[PDB]
Homo-oligomer: A and B are copies of this chain.
Amino acid sequence: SPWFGMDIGGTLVKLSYFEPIDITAEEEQEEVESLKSIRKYLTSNVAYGSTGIRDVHLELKDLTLFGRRGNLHFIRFPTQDLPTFIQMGRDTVLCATGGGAYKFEKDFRTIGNLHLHKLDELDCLVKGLLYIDSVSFNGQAECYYFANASEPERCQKMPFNLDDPYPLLVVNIGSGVSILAVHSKDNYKRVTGTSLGGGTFLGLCSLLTGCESFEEALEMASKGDSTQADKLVRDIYGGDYERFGLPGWAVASSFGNMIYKEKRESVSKEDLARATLVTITNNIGSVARMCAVNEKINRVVFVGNFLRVNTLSMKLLAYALDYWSKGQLKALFLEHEGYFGAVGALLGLPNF
């Protein structure tokens, strides 16, 4: 039985797979050929079919888990392609979390030699996050922040120690956004959420620009100028709004310049991609700041796949939390951003 953990989200399926590297001579001999073919297929390919990807750079090597030494692998594919994954599975104890553990429960049970154990999406997140940080990223910090995020000639990624990680605000940016207040390893609550998340960025961007991938959307946004679409404080006041400490550059109305036909006619797709990214990211940052203030928590860690290969949004979040909180809040990030639920699921395996 291969050791998997699976997080089936609204958009992406994340899979953590533990590859034993201490396979003895007797164990190799007693290996069922199908179990051998799984391990060979998973470790000898980095693309699976047309849409599966192994994130090789995230691999944890020589991890000790459940008393065995092995490597922890991190794999993702679109939830839309889960029927393909299940069909190829019909050609094992599976701990599964995310909404799709419930939605596709019956489909997983079409695999006769499969027991499905559903685990809560956010309990797995907490356990996975705390575990990965505890074992480290192959000796490097799992957690990092952007030092001096207000000055760009100085803004740089630096490691951050989470050895006493409580209390902690966790902002899970997936399709939507869940915000968790973690007070201890067994004491956490979902403070709130927002539906303006990664799927809003991707959905709106596709409507506005015709982009066909998340990566293409980010590439368009990198070339854009969001102030072509956004109305700024200085467009309304002619400068700063000093009475309430609002700088001229702050966005007063997202997409607010698009009420004018002549501006809609001159804006570029790249501008609109960037305005979509900026709008969604700042709104998440502002919501996170308000929850942190209300929960009295000054460490805010952002996870979920909206931030993978998305340094723009990370820097936007780093700068915004630091600026608007006058340095009282810190935006934290984690290398294994999208995978903590899948890892937490895998960690539930002993209970079964």
Contact = CB atoms under 8 A, between A and B. Distances in A.
Contacts of A204: 204, 255, 258
A264 B237 CA distance: 38
Interface stretch (A59-67, A97-105, A136-144, A311-319): A97-105
A207 B244 contact: no
Interface in A223-266: 229-231, 233, 235-239, 241, 243-244, 246, 250-261, 264
Contact of A203 (B122, B207, B253, B293): B253
Interface stretch (A47-55, A125-133, A279-287): A279-287
A259 B290 contact: no
A103 B236 CA distance: 7
Q: Copies per complex?
A: 2
Given A252-B195, A253-B195, A287-B290, A203 B279 contact: no
Contact of A241 (B99, B196, B243, B250): B99
A102 B195 contact: no
Contact of A175 (B197, B253, B272): B253
B251 A100 contact: no
30 contacts: A10-B235, A10-B256, A11-B259, A98-B236, A99-B238, A103-B236, A120-B243, A175-B253, A175-B256, A176-B256, A195-B252, A195-B253, A196-B254, A196-B283, A197-B253, A200-B253, A200-B254, A200-B255, A202-B259, A203-B255, A203-B257, A203-B258, A204-B258, A206-B264, A207-B258, A207-B272, A287-B287, A290-B290, A293-B294, A294-B294
